[PDB]
Enzyme design. Structure first.
Site, PDB file in Angstrom:
ATOM      1  CG  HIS A   1      52.278  33.802   1.614  1.00  0.00           C
ATOM      2  ND1 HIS A   1      52.525  32.551   2.137  1.00  0.00           N
ATOM      3  CD2 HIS A   1      52.332  33.663   0.266  1.00  0.00           C
ATOM      4  CE1 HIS A   1      52.692  31.689   1.149  1.00  0.00           C
ATOM      5  NE2 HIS A   1      52.580  32.339   0.004  1.00  0.00           N
TER       6      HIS A   1
ATOM      7  CB  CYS B   1      51.720  30.845  -4.364  1.00  0.00           C
ATOM      8  SG  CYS B   1      52.999  31.459  -3.197  1.00  0.00           S
TER       9      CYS B   1
HETATM   10  N1  LIG Z   1      52.673  27.733  -0.726  1.00  0.00           N
HETATM   11  C1  LIG Z   1      53.676  26.734  -1.040  1.00  0.00           C
HETATM   12  O1  LIG Z   1      53.948  25.864  -0.269  1.00  0.00           O
HETATM   13  C2  LIG Z   1      54.328  26.887  -2.439  1.00  0.00           C
HETATM   14  C3  LIG Z   1      53.621  27.568  -3.385  1.00  0.00           C
HETATM   15  C4  LIG Z   1      54.145  27.726  -4.645  1.00  0.00           C
HETATM   16  C5  LIG Z   1      55.404  27.193  -4.902  1.00  0.00           C
HETATM   17  N2  LIG Z   1      56.112  26.529  -3.958  1.00  0.00           N
HETATM   18  C6  LIG Z   1      57.318  26.036  -4.310  1.00  0.00           C
HETATM   19  O2  LIG Z   1      57.236  24.550  -4.494  1.00  0.00           O
HETATM   20  C7  LIG Z   1      58.367  24.039  -4.050  1.00  0.00           C
HETATM   21  C8  LIG Z   1      58.115  23.041  -2.982  1.00  0.00           C
HETATM   22  O3  LIG Z   1      57.512  23.713  -1.930  1.00  0.00           O
HETATM   23  P1  LIG Z   1      56.793  22.875  -0.764  1.00  0.00           P
HETATM   24  O4  LIG Z   1      55.983  23.854   0.053  1.00  0.00           O
HETATM   25  O5  LIG Z   1      55.965  21.749  -1.332  1.00  0.00           O
HETATM   26  O6  LIG Z   1      57.991  22.317   0.180  1.00  0.00           O
HETATM   27  P2  LIG Z   1      57.998  20.905   0.969  1.00  0.00           P
HETATM   28  O7  LIG Z   1      59.084  20.939   1.989  1.00  0.00           O
HETATM   29  O8  LIG Z   1      56.654  20.607   1.560  1.00  0.00           O
HETATM   30  O9  LIG Z   1      58.333  19.724  -0.140  1.00  0.00           O
HETATM   31  C9  LIG Z   1      59.641  19.611  -0.667  1.00  0.00           C
HETATM   32  C10 LIG Z   1      59.862  18.069  -0.866  1.00  0.00           C
HETATM   33  O10 LIG Z   1      60.988  17.854  -1.518  1.00  0.00           O
HETATM   34  C11 LIG Z   1      61.779  16.716  -0.689  1.00  0.00           C
HETATM   35  N3  LIG Z   1      63.187  16.899  -1.063  1.00  0.00           N
HETATM   36  C12 LIG Z   1      63.997  17.812  -0.514  1.00  0.00           C
HETATM   37  N4  LIG Z   1      65.203  17.705  -1.126  1.00  0.00           N
HETATM   38  C13 LIG Z   1      65.116  16.736  -2.061  1.00  0.00           C
HETATM   39  C14 LIG Z   1      66.023  16.208  -2.969  1.00  0.00           C
HETATM   40  N5  LIG Z   1      67.420  16.619  -3.145  1.00  0.00           N
HETATM   41  N6  LIG Z   1      65.653  15.234  -3.796  1.00  0.00           N
HETATM   42  C15 LIG Z   1      64.384  14.742  -3.752  1.00  0.00           C
HETATM   43  N7  LIG Z   1      63.492  15.258  -2.857  1.00  0.00           N
HETATM   44  C16 LIG Z   1      63.867  16.245  -2.024  1.00  0.00           C
HETATM   45  C17 LIG Z   1      61.497  16.953   0.551  1.00  0.00           C
HETATM   46  O11 LIG Z   1      61.687  15.734   1.395  1.00  0.00           O
HETATM   47  C18 LIG Z   1      59.993  17.378   0.490  1.00  0.00           C
HETATM   48  O12 LIG Z   1      59.117  16.324   0.571  1.00  0.00           O
HETATM   49  C19 LIG Z   1      59.297  25.294  -3.509  1.00  0.00           C
HETATM   50  O13 LIG Z   1      60.192  25.599  -4.649  1.00  0.00           O
HETATM   51  C20 LIG Z   1      58.484  26.217  -3.216  1.00  0.00           C
HETATM   52  O14 LIG Z   1      59.079  27.586  -3.341  1.00  0.00           O
HETATM   53  C21 LIG Z   1      55.593  26.356  -2.710  1.00  0.00           C
END
Ligand SMILES: NC(=O)c1ccc[n+]([C@@H]2O[C@H](COP(=O)([O-])OP(=O)(O)OC[C@H]3O[C@@H](n4cnc5c(N)ncnc54)[C@H](O)[C@@H]3O)[C@@H](O)[C@H]2O)c1
Ligand SMILES: NC(=O)c1ccc[n+]([C@@H]2O[C@H](COP(=O)([O-])OP(=O)(O)OC[C@H]3O[C@@H](n4cnc5c(N)ncnc54)[C@H](O)[C@@H]3O)[C@@H](O)[C@H]2O)c1
Ligand SMILES: NC(=O)c1ccc[n+]([C@@H]2O[C@H](COP(=O)([O-])OP(=O)(O)OC[C@H]3O[C@@H](n4cnc5c(N)ncnc54)[C@H](O)[C@@H]3O)[C@@H](O)[C@H]2O)c1
Ligand SMILES: NC(=O)c1ccc[n+]([C@@H]2O[C@H](COP(=O)([O-])OP(=O)(O)OC[C@H]3O[C@@H](n4cnc5c(N)ncnc54)[C@H](O)[C@@H]3O)[C@@H](O)[C@H]2O)c1
Lengths: 336, 339, 341, 336
Positions: free
Chosen positions: C184, C157
């Site tokens: 953030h 992000c």
């Molecule tokens: N602001 C943000 O939230 C944001 C922004 C940009 C990028 N990201 C990136 O996106 C990615 C996800 O972030 P998020 O905020 O959505 O986290 P999150 O915890 O909300 O979602 C992660 C999902 O993956 C599931 N999961 C975990 N392990 C798993 C596995 N082995 N197999 C299948 N499913 C699995 C979890 O149950 C969960 O639903 C991260 O890499 C994060 O760095 C997040």
């Protein structure tokens, strides 16, 4: 004919009422009165922490601002007696400051150069008709000069209590509303101008008990429940969104399923029904005045006597405002 | 048992006024005899007793007619909006802590100095360019005790000043920009609504937003550190914690440095007002602390390209208790030397 | 929904904040369709979390749980719960491109687990994915893709916020060096209350909605993957603060040229597009929640500090770390699917 | 003369229990088990968002950390059968992980190289003695191998319900606890491992309804109230601090003053009494298990029958922890 409306107090309720009026054909706002300059009011209309960006164009002008090119005059008169509502053809004033929520105070708008009628966006005392739309708006005939839209909690409680009472007979009840903090609480511990030692505390960092008259005053809306209910509030750190719990004894023994069915049968545009396990953010912005939650219904029975618990959600901002503008739209159509 | 005390009045029994009262309870040479606000004694007594962020009062508080007793000692309470109507002299008040936010300039603060009033005023805020502005243990040596109005600066200034001075003395600050990530305060709106000061960002729900805001601390640092006049500027981001803040400063320097060099210079300058830590703390860990500024060695950074460096130094502060500890240190010292 | 746009089938691994918001945005584009969701839970949990969203609002449509998945507007989407990508039979549901949004497979070799014989064909990591995968900020450098890639990254992000601002400033005036602070929103990797952090981060261990929390971030140091001329010139860090979404990036630099605030703001506005917005309104973080810009430059926060002829320059851009990033991610996914081969 | 204690789960309750044990003579912690490195546990003990800086020094060492100079061993065994409690002389284990809160699960600690007794810091099922100190700790004889310190809500509810029942006779009741969010809720909307669609939602951004067994299970502490109460919770955004409301019918009609007097007469070190209009932050860190709030008492009477409302505060963290360590201390002294 369009009925011209003025807003006194362009606050949370005033601004959201303005937003909903944009989608009403029979009513238009021609004058806003508050305590600040047009740039401040125009900015607060455009950008809204809990209810999102305004759907339209807003441009500040001298003496007011344009909404989609339509100029709306802004004044800053602390005293309703000094608001020349008549200059802008205003017939009905939305009294939304929180400082004139009584019959004689609201009548200050009705001076020689003022308006003709007032809708108080709050409980207004027991000598003004108090309307929860789709529960008792039949009491209006349009000759009224001052009416009340009740409180947010009353608009949540009233359809639920009325449906339960009509079906089973409420004998007595106690209400707790777990309620978002509002602008009348202090952002941090400090002197509360109304003398409330609990509203004096940091509203976004505390569970704050508080009184509320919604249950004790329900007789203004449901006369048969006068003298039957009381209750209180717990103010908690969400910036909008609330829930009302009501515990009663009834004339009839009931089941949870029978209760939920009676609520669903009474559902309409004001009183919603859900079986989904939602949380408070899910009702932010909804247009129901009250959203009954069947997942929270409980019956506790001992020795053939029952305590009955029914629970309904409300966005104390948009749920109340949708009810207020329904009542305003109806009142304006029949005003005389 | 002794009577070696200077009597103080508090105008504005708010966050800073009440915490100053709390700290004065542990100072032998100053005693509060009069409080003026806009409310009744039960509201003030209750707010002294119970405190969301700073905990229960250490003592007994009992409302009485016209005031309240703290451990049995009566404090008079009045509710005069205008300082000209506060008869400070009746309660022997020599110095007023001007903590309302509404009289934070020289001519306004001097309203306390009428013929039935006080002798001196300490403004609990920046007070303009023509009043001595004191960060205790950084420049309280400028006081001689003849002053009638002085300023305790802001919270942010009391955080920034010892850090900037230690860095400048060691390596020479050329220019700098400051960002303070700061708790919301009582001057922000609890929910979106008209801000009386005309600030379209302070108008917004303070506990539900990241809120940019101006601050004069960096630009006005020359009142505390003259060598840094015209060298710093900055701004704030107000965020949803009810107290506790942090100040980041980015500079260029006359000398090239390492992170270890910087951290050592800060530690060598540490004292009762300027703390030093190497633990990876967060804002709740400094609530209630009595340092005016707590340097955090874990956030120091140096970015070098082509032999030129940007240097970042960061210090924590409880905008409530850190500032109040500094304010009462200054009040206690000023009281000792007052005319 | 009778159209002539070719359709590439997509799978989502990790139906979390980014995974669910990506699904929401894909509803409104036609070249891509989600036919398979993999997570670690049951279909009713995923359906409920799609329908109701604390920060991004009610889902626009109907969601109904079914055996083995749920229907979105009456269209069934299969849900599985396979912990190992090697056991996700993506190919059964025709999936060719996987959104890797779990946070647990954000490196080249890890994402390649999806590309087994019954798996998918390409992966888009919804995070920084290491130095050896193409890292794309849409409308800044998506031209580096040729469609033959098997694993790419949508960056972070913060990178999608920083990149267009830093690129515009560098092209106009020449960035010499810089330091970045992003204030953030807290995220799901922080603890709701003080407790052991699985990643070993003593500050993410603290109650995320009750603290200002310093933290590392690689966005500035790694900017060379997106803007090669800025490799080795920037560094920075984060302050995580108690809002559940919505963030802002401050960048302080020295430049090859002396500038005015108006010249800086003019250069940013000239570079604005669907990904990089421009505002002069004094907004706050809730005003960007749900925005589709990857980066919203805020001209009201620009500063120049000049001493003895040399300047420090500060530029600031908003971003919804949820929807800003997701809009960029789906733009990249849509473009990637078009040219994929 | 000093009983050695081990802590399984160095979390909120585990760490606060360790803090309170610092100030008592009869017990000392000699072993900590969790799932992480010693520096993580040392850091979390030293710095505490809601309960403040630790009172003393904490220094990370090899295989543990030193508290005021005294080394505490730290291990990271997920299975209690692998924790060799006996090699650190541990007699009683505080089972505070949230994952072994039933009789057979807690008995995993009592292997050949394990401990001899375990106290579950949570409800532990209906077949283990469940103790609210100063309400029913007289049921312990010291031979028990697994006991339960009940829940935070139970320690709040029990002294209030017992005093009201003893004085006036509770017939039936419904309880609502407005409760701080806890570590089992998600920080942001996401899959909840326990399958709870409401604990899946962002805990610091919502009013979140949830079930709680405290009222239905009260018979483990007050046998005469078995089958008489039920209730639920509303989790709200404060990081600690909670309040319990109880609405009952009684065998005798009462006044608000009579109720408040009965509560004050029952007050002790566990059950406090206040008439000050406090809010949730005022009970953070308090050592009462339950603090009755006379300002929120209500009686609603119609036709000679009454609904009675009584409310009591609790820091679900420190109030429960003070009760838990009171029970641990007493249990240790009669242990056999
Ligand atoms: N602001 C943000 O939230 C944001 C922004 C940009 C990028 N990201 C990136 O996106 C990615 C996800 O972030 P998020 O905020 O959505 O986290 P999150 O915890 O909300 O979602 C992660 C999902 O993956 C599931 N999961 C975990 N392990 C798993 C596995 N082995 N197999 C299948 N499913 C699995 C979890 O149950 C969960 O639903 C991260 O890499 C994060 O760095 C997040
Ligand atoms: N949940 C809610 O917020 C809610 C719900 C239902 C009813 N109400 C009721 O609506 C009314 C307004 O509540 P609110 O939350 O919008 O408060 P608010 O503080 O947001 O708005 C009040 C507005 O009135 C302005 N104002 C104050 N005094 C004035 C005066 N003498 N003349 C002109 N303008 C003045 C203020 O500047 C402000 O903009 C209250 O009576 C309140 O009880 C509020
Ligand atoms: N982090 C902080 O809160 C902080 C830190 C440093 C300095 N300051 C400064 O301290 C001052 C007070 O700040 P605060 O946070 O304590 O605000 P506050 O709102 O908590 O307290 C202000 C008090 O002054 C009272 N008051 C207002 N007008 C008055 C009048 N005409 N006469 C008498 N009493 C009046 C108010 O009722 C209130 O109790 C400000 O100048 C502020 O800039 C605040
Ligand atoms: N308000 C409260 O927090 C509260 C009040 C009363 C009772 N309780 C009860 O106390 C218990 C713990 O609650 P908490 O809030 O402290 O939770 P927590 O998450 O803060 O702490 C639980 C600890 O157990 C550790 N752990 C998890 N699994 C483990 C395992 N297999 N082996 C060893 N360690 C393991 C975790 O790393 C964590 O440190 C729960 O049963 C809970 O119901 C909590």
């Amino acid at each position: 004919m369009v009925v011209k409306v003025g807003i006194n107090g362009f606050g949370r309720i005033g601004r959201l009422a303005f937003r909903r009026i944009q989608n009403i054909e029979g009513v238009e706002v021609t004058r806003i009165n508050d305590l600040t300059d047009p740039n401040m009011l125009a900015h607060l209309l455009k950008y809204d922490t809990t209810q999102g960006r305004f759907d339209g164009t807003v441009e500040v002008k001298e003496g007011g601002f344009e909404v989609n090119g339509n100029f709306i005059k802004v004044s800053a008169e602390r005293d309703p007696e000094n608001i020349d509502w008549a200059t802008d053809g205003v017939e009905i004033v939305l009294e939304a400051t929180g400082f004139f929520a009584k019959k004689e105070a609201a009548e200050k708008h009705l001076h020689a150069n003022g308006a003709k009628k007032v809708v108080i966006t709050a409980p207004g005392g027991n000598d003004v008709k108090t309307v929860v739309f789709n529960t008792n708006h039949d009491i209006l005939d349009g000759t009224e000069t001052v009416i009340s839209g009740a409180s947010c909690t009353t608009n949540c409680l009233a359809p639920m209590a009325k449906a339960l009472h009509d079906a089973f007979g409420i004998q007595k009840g106690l209400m707790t509303t777990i309620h978002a903090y509002t602008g009348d609480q202090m952002i941090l511990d400090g002197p509360h101008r109304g003398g409330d030692l609990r509203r004096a505390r940091a509203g976004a960092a505390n569970i704050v008990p508080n009184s509320t008259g919604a249950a004790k005053a329900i007789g203004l809306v449901i006369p048969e429940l006068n003298g039957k209910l009381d209750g209180a509030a717990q103010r908690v750190p969400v910036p909008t969104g609330s829930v009302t719990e009501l515990v009663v004894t009834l004339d009839k023994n009931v089941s949870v399923d029978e209760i939920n069915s009676a609520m669903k049968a009474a559902s309409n545009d004001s009183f919603g029904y859900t079986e989904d396990p939602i949380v408070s953010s899910d009702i932010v912005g909804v247009s129901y005045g009250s959203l009954f939650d069947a997942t929270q219904t409980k019956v506790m029975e001992v020795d053939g006597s029952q305590l009955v618990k029914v629970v309904s959600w409300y966005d104390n901002e948009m749920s109340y405002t949708a009810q207020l503008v329904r009542t305003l739209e109806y009142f304006a159509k029949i005003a005389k």
